[PDB]
Amino acid sequence: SPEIMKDLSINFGKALDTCKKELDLPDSINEDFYKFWKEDYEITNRLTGCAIKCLSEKLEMVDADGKLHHGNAREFAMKHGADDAMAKQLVDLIHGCEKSIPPNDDRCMEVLSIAMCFKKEIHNLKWAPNMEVVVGEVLAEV
DSSP states (O other), X not given: OXXXXXXXXXXXXXXXXXXXXXXXXXHHHHHHHHHHTTSSOOOOOHHHHHHHHHHHHHHHHHOTTTOOBTTBOHHHHHXXXXXXXXXXXXXXXXXXXXXXXXXXXXXXXXXXXXXXXXHHHHHHHSOXXXXXXXXXXXXXXX
């Protein structure tokens, strides 16, 4: 029973814009980017990766509702559907990936490879939250 959108896409939008300006990303990519977190495509671009990071620091302009924060998605993921067991599994996975990749330090690369995994797996698991929670996840991670 959709028909909402009080102020979600807008926020994430202003945040993405600020980045594109600081990251210099042609809008063309802004669109293709959205697709990635919805299908199974891949932006495979160290740049689009830094973006995911930039957004994290933007958390202030992202969702000030008082839920999504560095190391806190459980609440932001619960409002959508990722309840306890879920949010826990979601975090236990996104993090599991971090525990999988070698002890690196390339946030852009580490955050990129995980995004592809965290989602892929969830897709074959059984269900799948909204691209929203998924984002607040990679972001809240760092």
